[PDB]
Amino acid sequence: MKILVTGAAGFIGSHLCQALLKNSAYHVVGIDHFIGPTPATLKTGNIQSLELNSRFQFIREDILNTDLSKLLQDIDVVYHLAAIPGVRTSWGKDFQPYVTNNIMVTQQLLEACKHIKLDKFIHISTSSVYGEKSGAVSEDLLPIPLSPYGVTKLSGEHLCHVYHKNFHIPIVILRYFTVYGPRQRPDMAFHRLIKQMLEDKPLTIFGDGTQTRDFTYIDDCIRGTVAALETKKNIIGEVINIGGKEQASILDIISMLEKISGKSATKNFLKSVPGEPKQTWADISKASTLLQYSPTVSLSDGLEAEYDYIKQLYK
Template identity: 60%
Template sequence: MNILVTGAAGFIGSHVCEALLQHHHVIGIDCFIGPTPKKWKEKTIDTLKKHDRFTWIEGDLLSLPLDNIVKRVDVIYHLAGMPGVRTSWGTSFDLYTTHNILATQRLLEACKQHRPKQFIYTSTSSVYGEKHGRVHEQTTPTPLSPYGITKLASEHLCHVYGSEFGVPITILRYFTVYGPRQRPDMAFHRFIRQMLFDEPITIFGDGTQTRDFTYISDCVDGTLAVLGNDKAIGETFNIGGKERASINDVIATLEEMIGKRANKQYMNQAIGEPKHTWADISKAERILSYAPNVSLQEGLRREVEYIRSLYGR
C-alpha cells in the first residue's frame, strides 16, 4: 500500500512514518515550518530515507503538484500544519490560515479528483475549548484560540468534501502528545531542558491546570488503528492518554527523575488555553480497539532520556 504522510518531518508525523514503513510504502512531505529547528527535522528525515520504502518530497502543499502525488497513493495521513496556541494570535494568524486551512483545502481538492481509500485528518483537543469532565466527540466545539479555530475549520472542510464528493475522511483529535522529538516550545521539552541547564522553569498560570497527556507511541497506535478500518470512515475520534496530571505534579516528577529542584517562575495564564482537558476515548476503544498503555511516569522517563541525549546533558 502507498501512503502519503504530510508533515513527515514533524514530531508526530515522523513517528507515524516509522510505524507505517514496517509494512507499507510511504511518501513523506514537509516544508519545515514551525518552531522545531530545521536541522533537527533534517536529521529525522535522513533516518527515514534509510528505508527502501520511503520517498521524500520537500515542499509546500500550497505549491506542490498535488494531483500528481495524490493519484499515486492509496491513503493520506494529513498531519502537516502550523502548530501552537500561544503563537496563533496577531499577525501570525496568516500563517495559521495558510498552512492549516488553505493547504488542507488544496489537498482535499486533489482527493476529489483522485479519490484515495482513506483521508485521515489529524486535529486537536484545542477545538473543544473550556469544558468540564471528560469530553466526547459529540461535545460542541468552542475553541479558545485562533489555532483551534483553524483546526476546526479544516475539520469542517473535511466533512463537506466527504459529503459532497465522497472523500472517505476520518478525523483524529489528539490530546497533548509528548515524547521523543517533541517540539522545543512544548511544555515537557521546555521544562526538562530548563532544569538540565539550571534555568528558571516558566509556567503559564498557577500550575494546577491539568492535561490528558498522550505518549507518542500510544498516539501512533491510535493513528494507525484507523488504517483499513471501514468503520472509521466519516467518524471523529479522541486520541487521549493513559492518565491526567497537573503541571505542578509533572514538575515534581521531573525533579525526582533529574535530581534537581526546579526554579519555578509562574507567569500569567496563556490566553486561549483551557484550564483542563480530559478525553473520553470510549469511542476509539470500541471501534479502533485503542488502548493507551504508557504511564506518565514511564513516558516522562523516556523523554528525559531523549532530551539529555539531544542537548548532551
C-alpha cells in the same frame, strides 16, 4: 499500500512514518518544507534516516506549491498532519500562517482527492477545538475553541465534512490530546521544562501550574493513528479522540521530573497566556470501540523517555 504523510518531518509525522515503514507492505511518501516552530536543524536527521528505507520517499515542498494531481495519483491513504501548531503563538501578526497552512492546505488536499479513489483520508486535529469544558469530552460536543489556532484546526475538520458529504472523500478525523515523548517539539511544555531543569534554569510555568492535560505518550498516539488505517470497522466520517493513559497538572509533571532527575527545580510563575483551557480530558470510549485503542504508557515511563531524549539532545 501507498501512504502520503503530510508534515512527515514534524514531531508526530516522523514517528508515524517510522511506524508505518515497519510493515514491509507499506510504502510511504512524506511531504514537508520545514516550517512552523521547530527549526529545520532538528528535522533533517530523522528524514535522512527514513530515506535509507527503499519504501520511503521525501518531498521537500510546500503542499500549496506542489502538483497535488502528480503527488496523489498512486496514493491509497492520506495521513494529513501538516499544520502550524501552537495555541500560544496564534495571535495578531502570527495568525496568517495558521490560516494558510491549516485551512488553505486542507482545502487543496481535499480538492485534489476528488480526482482519485482513496481508501481513507485521515485528518489529524486537536483537543484545542473543544475550548473549556467540564468532564471528559466526547466527540459530539459543540466545539468552541479558545484560541485562533483551535479555530483554524476546527475549520480544517469542517472542510473534511464538506468534502465527505459532497464528494464522498473517505475522511476520518483524529483529535489528539497534548502529545509528548522523544522528539516533542521545543515549544511544548515538557521539552521546555526538562531543558530548563537540566540547565538549572527556573522552570517557566504559565499561570499557577494547576492546569491539567490528557497527555498522550507518542507511542500511544501512533498506535491509535495506525489503528485508524488498520481497523476492520467502518470509521469513515467519524471524529475520534486519541488521548492518554493518565491526566496530570503541570505541577504534578514537575514533581515526577524532579523524582526522575534528582533535581530541585526553581519555579518561575508567569502570567497565564490567553487561549489556553484550564483542563483537557478526553473521553476515549469511541477510540476503544472503533480502533481497539487503549493507551498503555504511564506518565512516569513516558517522562523517563522524554528526559533521556532531551538530556541527549542538549548534551
